[PDB]
Each structure stands twice: as C-alpha cells, then as structure tokens.
Amino acid sequence: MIQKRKTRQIRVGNVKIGGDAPIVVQSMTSTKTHDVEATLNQIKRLYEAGCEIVRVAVPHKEDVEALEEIVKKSPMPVIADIHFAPSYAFLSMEKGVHGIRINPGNIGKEEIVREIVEEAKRRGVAVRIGVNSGSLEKDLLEKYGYPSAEALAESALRWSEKFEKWGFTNYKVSIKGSDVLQNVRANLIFAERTDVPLHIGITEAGMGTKGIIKSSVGIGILLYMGIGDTVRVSLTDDPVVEVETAYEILKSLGLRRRGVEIVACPTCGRIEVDLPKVVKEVQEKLSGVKTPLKVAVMGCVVNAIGEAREADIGLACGRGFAWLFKHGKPIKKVDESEMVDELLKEIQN
Amino acid sequence: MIQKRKTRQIRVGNVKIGGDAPIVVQSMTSTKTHDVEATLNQIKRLYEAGCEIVRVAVPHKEDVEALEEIVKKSPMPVIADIHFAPSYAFLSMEKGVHGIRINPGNIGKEEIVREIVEEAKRRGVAVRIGVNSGSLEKDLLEKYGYPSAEALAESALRWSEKFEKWGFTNYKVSIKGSDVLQNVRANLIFAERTDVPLHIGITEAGMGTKGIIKSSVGIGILLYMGIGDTVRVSLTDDPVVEVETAYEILKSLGLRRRGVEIVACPTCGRIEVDLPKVVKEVQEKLSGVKTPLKVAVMGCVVNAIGEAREADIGLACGRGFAWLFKHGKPIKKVDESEMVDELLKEIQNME
Ligand code: SF4
Numbered sequence: 001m002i003q004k005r006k007t008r009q010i011r012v013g014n015v016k017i018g019g020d021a022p023i024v025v026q027s028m029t030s031t032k033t034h035d036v037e038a039t040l041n042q043i044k045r046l047y048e049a050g051c052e053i054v055r056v057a058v059p060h061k062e063d064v065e066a067l068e069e070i071v072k073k074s075p076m077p078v079i080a081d082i083h084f085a086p087s088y089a090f091l092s093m094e095k096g097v098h099g100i101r102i103n104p105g106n107i108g109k110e111e112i113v114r115e116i117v118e119e120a121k122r123r124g125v126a127v128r129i130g131v132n133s134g135s136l137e138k139d140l141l142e143k144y145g146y147p148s149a150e151a152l153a154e155s156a157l158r159w160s161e162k163f164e165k166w167g168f169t170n171y172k173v174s175i176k177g178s179d180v181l182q183n184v185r186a187n188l189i190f191a192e193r194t195d196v197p198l199h200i201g202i203t204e205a206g207m208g209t210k211g212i213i214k215s216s217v218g219i220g221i222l223l224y225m226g227i228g229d230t231v232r233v234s235l236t237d238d239p240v241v242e243v244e245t246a247y248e249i250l251k252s253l254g255l256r257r258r259g260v261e262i263v264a265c266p267t268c269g270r271i272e273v274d275l276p277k278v279v280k281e282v283q284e285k286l287s288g289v290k291t292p293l294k295v296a297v298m299g300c301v302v303n304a305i306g307e308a309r310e311a312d313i314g315l316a317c318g319r320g321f322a323w324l325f326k327h328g329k330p331i332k333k334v335d336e337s338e339m340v341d342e343l344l345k346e347i348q349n
Numbered sequence: 350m351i352q353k354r355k356t357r358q359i360r361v362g363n364v365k366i367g368g369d370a371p372i373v374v375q376s377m378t379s380t381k382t383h384d385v386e387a388t389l390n391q392i393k394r395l396y397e398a399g400c401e402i403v404r405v406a407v408p409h410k411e412d413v414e415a416l417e418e419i420v421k422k423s424p425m426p427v428i429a430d431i432h433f434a435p436s437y438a439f440l441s442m443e444k445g446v447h448g449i450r451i452n453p454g455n456i457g458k459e460e461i462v463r464e465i466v467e468e469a470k471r472r473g474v475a476v477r478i479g480v481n482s483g484s485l486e487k488d489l490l491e492k493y494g495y496p497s498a499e500a501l502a503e504s505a506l507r508w509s510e511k512f513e514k515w516g517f518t519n520y521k522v523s524i525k526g527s528d529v530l531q532n533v534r535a536n537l538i539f540a541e542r543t544d545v546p547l548h549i550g551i552t553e554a555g556m557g558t559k560g561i562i563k564s565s566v567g568i569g570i571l572l573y574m575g576i577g578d579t580v581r582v583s584l585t586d587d588p589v590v591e592v593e594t595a596y597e598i599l600k601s602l603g604l605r606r607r608g609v610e611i612v613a614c615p616t617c618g619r620i621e622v623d624l625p626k627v628v629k630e631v632q633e634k635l636s637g638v639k640t641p642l643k644v645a646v647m648g649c650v651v652n653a654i655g656e657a658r659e660a661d662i663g664l665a666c667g668r669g670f671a672w673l674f675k676h677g678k679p680i681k682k683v684d685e686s687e688m689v690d691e692l693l694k695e696i697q698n699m700e
Pocket residue numbers: 265266267268269270271272298299300301303304307482494495496
C-alpha cells in the first residue's frame with residue numbers, strides 16, 4: 001500500500017540500508033562505553049530483541065580504548081557517536097568501527113569534515129550526517145532567521161551535495177526537527193530532492209507512555225509516506241523497549257516484524273467457515289515459530305487470495321478444505337488437515 | 350502546517366463537531382449499561398479526564414431502560430450503540446439520548462433505516478453511520494471481490510448520499526479497515542469526495558502498549574492529513590487511558606491538549622540566555638494553570654517571535670529582558686521579572 005521512496009543502497013558492515021533492503025531497526029547503548037562488559041551485555045540483549053545496528057557514545061579517551069573490543073565481540077555493526085573532536089572520529093575508525101555519526105555543522109572547519117569523509121572512504125566506514133537546530137550554520141540562520149524546517153533541510157542538502165562533490169557516496173542523513181510536524185516537513189523537503197537514505201526518529205520524545213505515543217505518531221507519518229531507511233525510537237528507557245517500540249510501529253504498517261504474525265480476515269458476507277476455530281488451531285500449531293512471516297487465515301477461498309497478496313503464506317479456507325497460498329499465488333488444495341502442511345511449508349521456507 | 354479538511358458542522362447535544370469546531374475526544378464506557386451506578390461513576394471519571402462525548406453499548410432490554418436515568422445527569426452528550434436489533438434505536442431515542450450509531454448495511458432493510466433517520470431529525474439526535482467489512486453489501490462485494498479500502502469507502506459514500514436524499518444532514522461516518530493502511534486509505538477516499546464529518550480510531554488495536562502504538566500510528570496519519578473531526582482510541586484497558594492517549598496524539602500534532610503546555614526552543618547558535626534556568630522558573634510559576642494554552646520559552650529575542658507564531662503566548666529572552674508575545678506579535682518588553690507579567694497576562698487571558 002505504501003509507495004516507498006527510491007533510495008541508493010549503502011552498507012554498514014553486513015547490513016544493507018536503502019533501496020531494496022528492509023527498513024533497519026537501530027538503537028543506542030545507554031551504558032558507559034568504557035565499561036566493555038556492561039555495554040556488550042546490553043548489545044547482546046539488543047541483538048536478542050532484533051536490533052540490527054547499534055550506536056555507541058564515545059565522549060572520552062577511555063571509550064576509544066574500549067571500542068576495539070566492542071567491535072570484535074559485537075554481533076552487530078557499531079556506530080561511533082562523535083561530537084567535538086575531529087580526532088575522535090579518526091581514532092574511532094582505526095578501532096574497527098563500522099560507522100561514524102557526526103554533526104558536520106559544528107565538528108570543525110568544512111575542510112576537516114572533508115578529511116573525515118576521505119578517511120571513511122579509505123576504510124569503508126559509513127557516515128551519518130546529523131543536522132539539527134544546534135548544528136545549523138551561521139549563514140543559513142541569517143537566511144531563515146530561525147531553525148525552520150526548510151533551514152534544516154537545506155543544511156542537509158548542502159552537506160549532501162558537498163559529500164557528492166568530494167566523491168563520497170556511502171552516507172545517510174538525519175534531520176531532527178523540534179516537534180513532529182517540523183521533523184516531518186524537514187525530512188520531506190530533503191526526501192523529495194535527493195536519493196540519500198534517511199535515518200528517522202523523534203529525539204526528545206518524552207517519558208514512558210507519552211514518549212512512545214509521540215514516537216509512534218512521528219515515525220509512523222514519515223513511514224506512511226515511504227520515508228525512512230533506518231529507524232530509532234529515542235526513549236529515556238531501556239534501549240530494548242526502544243527496539244520493541246520500533247518493531248510495533250513497523251508492524252502496524254506491515255514493513256517489519258519479529259517472529260510469526262498470524263492475521264485473520266476482516267471478515268465479510270462471503271465467509272465460508274468458522275474462522276475463529278481455524279485461527280485458534282493456527283495459533284496453537286504455529287506457536288514457537290521464529291521466522292518473520294505474516295501468516296494469513298482467510299474466511300473464504302477464491303477472493304481471499306487476491307485479498308492476501310502481501311502475506312507471505314496463508315490458508316484460504318473452504319467448507320471441508322483450504323487452499324495453501326504463497327506470496328499471492330495458490331499452491332495446492334488440502335483437506336481439514338491443512339495446518340500441518342502449512343507448518344511443513346514454513347519449515348521449508 | 351496542518352491542511353485541515355473542509356467539513357460541515359454537526360451537533361451532538363450541545364457539543365459541536367466538524368467544520369469550525371476543534372477535534373472532539375470521544376470514549377466508550379466499559380461497565381454494563383444496566384448497572385446505572387457503575388456507568389455514571391465511569392462517566393464522571395471520563396469527563397474529569399477530558400472526554401467530551403460518551404458512547405454507551407446497549408445489547409439487551411434492561412440497558413434501554415437504564416438510558417433514561419443516564420442522560421438526565423450526565424455532563425456529556427450520550428450516544429447509544431445499536432448492534433443487533435434496530436428496535437433498540439427507536440427505544441433509545443425516546444429515552445432522550447443525544448446520538449445513535451448504526452451499521453445500516455446489515456441493520457435490516459432500507460425501509461426501517463429510513464424511519465430511524467426520520468425520527469432522528471424530529472427529535473434532533475445525531476446518527477453515526479458505521480461501515481465495515483461485515484456491513485458491506487452483496488452489490489459492492491461483487492464489484493471489488495473483497496472488502497477493499499475503496500469497497501469500504503463507496504459503501505460509506507452511498508449511505509451518506511441516501512441520508513441526503515431523505516433530507517438528513519446531522520450525521521457523521523466511521524470506516525473500519527482491516528489494518529492501519531486500509532483504514533487510512535478508505536477514510537482518505539471518503540474525505541476527498543464529501544464534506545461529511547469523520548469519526549476516526551483503530552478498533553482492534555491490541556492490549557496495553559501495543560494498542561497504544563497502533564492507535565497512535567493509525568490516528569496520527571489521518572490527523573496529519575487533516576482528516577478526523579472526532580477521535581476515539583480503542584484499548585482493552587481502562588476508558589480513561591483511551592482519553593489520555595487521544596489527547597497525547599492530538600498534542601504531538603498541536604491540535605488539542607489538557608492543561609498548560611510549556612515548550613522551550615530547540616535551541617540554536619543565536620541563544621542569548623541560560624534557557625534551562627528560565628524554563629524551570631516558568632514551570633514553577635505556571636504550575637496551577639488549567640487553561641490549555643501553549644506557552645513558548647524561547648532562547649533569543651527577535652527571531653524567536655516568528656519561530657513561535659503558533660504558540661498562544663511566550664517569552665523571547667535576552668540578557669536583562671524578554672519580549673512578551675502572543676500569536677506571533679510582540680506586546681511589551683519586561684525586565685528579568687518577565688515571569689510574573691507572563692502569568693499576569695495568562696490570568697487576564699482567562700477573564
Ligand atoms: S477472505 Fe473472503 S470472507 Fe474474509 S474478508 Fe476477504 S472476501 Fe470476506
């Protein structure tokens with residue numbers, strides 16, 4: 001249903017971002033990075049919950065000294081989060097880091113940003129351009145007066161086309177608007193002018209329930225419009241909750257999922273079976289399937305197949321039988337023992 | 350920034366829905382209707398949490414005789430949910446109920462529906478047209494094959510224009526989709542083809558956090574596209590939480606709120622003051638303001654005022670002073686005792 005934004009594909013370690021690739025779920029470590037064992041324990045929990053790339057803060061000397069061990073033992077690509085010293089970007093990259101994220105706007109002189117980018121090109125490390133009100137250049141503040149959506153977007157564009165000029169192509173940008181509406185607009189202006197992958201999220205979303213709502217609204221809207229190649233929910237909470245939240249939002253729009261998802265039809269006046277009965281049977285035999293598949297349990301046979309185009313696999317149920325279908329095309333007719341064969345086909349998938 | 354859909358105004362009791370009106374927060378009661386004490390106690394709790402219209406389910410005969418007492422002392426306009434028997438619709442309207450909701454596609458034959466509608470015009474009671482896959486007619490089901498977004502939308506349009514034919518205007522519609530994406534598309538198709546008020550919400554959102562997330566996505570999208578004149582969040586949780594969720598969704602897009610909202614600037618390289626300090630001062634002095642205003646505490650002076658156009662009121666702070674502003678216009682320069690004058694203006698905003 002969503003018309004995805006065309007985007008060039010990039011790479012952070014083993015993970016594809018943009019274009020053809022699924023939208024990636026990201027998170028940030030909340031532990032002190034210099035504490036190797038605590039951070040790796042949190043990364044492992046993040047991996048367990050489906051976090052695909054992890055961002056690691058590196059504010060001090062001791063965090064740089066921890067980075068090598070973290071990358072070697074991380075089941076995930078690691079992004080080094082840099083803020084003030086261009087040298088930390090260089091030192092982080094030498095430590096084996098798969099990605100750096102910088103605010104090119106205040107990291108230093110433009111010519112130093114070029115060197116960071118040229119070093120990243122030599123080591124095959126991805127870059128994230130972060131742009132926000134605090135990184136907005138003096139020249140654009142004068143043009144717009146204040147950090148407007150357009151001011152933030154033009155900044156992102158400006159840097160993006162500098163990266164292209166410098167011959168560097170392996171980057172994604174991130175635009176943090178002050179609220180949901182400014183965040184949407186700022187990214188929307190950028191999205192429509194370029195094919196550069198986008199990191200999306202709401203920075204200071206809030207606490208617990210309220211933060212979760214604001215995140216769902218913000219990320220959901222962008223996602224709806226086919227915008228976002230990577231996602232992070234930013235909650236002042238356990239980073240696993242942040243990962244779980246991101247997956248629920250994506251699941252809402254049928255873009256990603258964790259484990260098996262069993263969906264029943266609406267239903268309608270075409271219904272041919274007792275759907276609640278077969279659904280219950282499906283839930284029981286498919287309990288303990290750890291494969292990100294949308295499974296469709298449909299009330300009729302013929303029209304159900306068209307209806308469940310986007311489902312990976314499902315059963316189009318008739319009075320004494322069902323049709324097993326796969327990616328919108330029917331495979332075979334099976335008796336009221338269609339479920340074991342549906343399970344059999346998923347183990348084969 | 351929000352492109353609000355042009356809608357005609359309707360009335361449910363004394364509450365205005367659509368057109369010029371703010372988006373109405375609605376909720377359904379969870380207790381049995383025939384229990385009169387439990388329902389009115391929950392209604393009071395919902396009103397205190399900001400709920401503007403209450404929906405009351407009526408599946409049996411005892412629940413109908415309960416309605417009379419409920420509508421007399423309820424602070425909210427009450428709406429009866431007519432499910433199985435269309436007989437309940439006539440009986441509910443005689444009880445003095447402000448609104449009804451029916452699924453006319455399966456509530457019976459068209460003749461009876463027409464009489465339900467004509468009785469609603471004489472009493473002055475609003476009708477909500479409920480359309481979902483289950484209420485879809487054999488006619489359209491054969492046109493589209495299955496209950497697609499455009500199948501759902503056409504049914505809503507068809508019933509809408511049948512109400513027009515009967516000379517009835519005081520109605521709104523809701524369209525339930527299979528998932529968020531279908532719900533959005535079906536409501537979008539309807540929204541562009543008519544000026545009829547829409548009730549929006551996700552019916553089977555889920556339990557707890559999962560339900561909250563799914564609702565926020567579904568409602569957030571439609572709200573962003575300027576669609577929805579009344580909202581209900583549907584959770585298996587407490588109805589009060591639904592109201593709390595609805596207000597937070599609307600708050601994130603700056604459409605509705607409960608109580609004061611104090612917002613600081615981003616900030617940026619123009620910053621003229623220690624903002625966290627002045628923000629904490631505002632939080633302290635403004636604690637005790639119940640009016641749903643948006644108060645902006647900005648880091649600089651000149652360019653801050655334009656930045657905070659949409660805010661009801663705020664301070665644009667400099668070294669030893671600040672500009673007090675409302676809706677993007679400067680009003681008076683105040684010394685670093687800029688705060689007592691800000692509250693003094695908000696007190697005066699209320700009178
Ligand atoms: S699968 Fe068949 S019975 Fe179920 S909603 Fe679709 S058309 Fe109706």
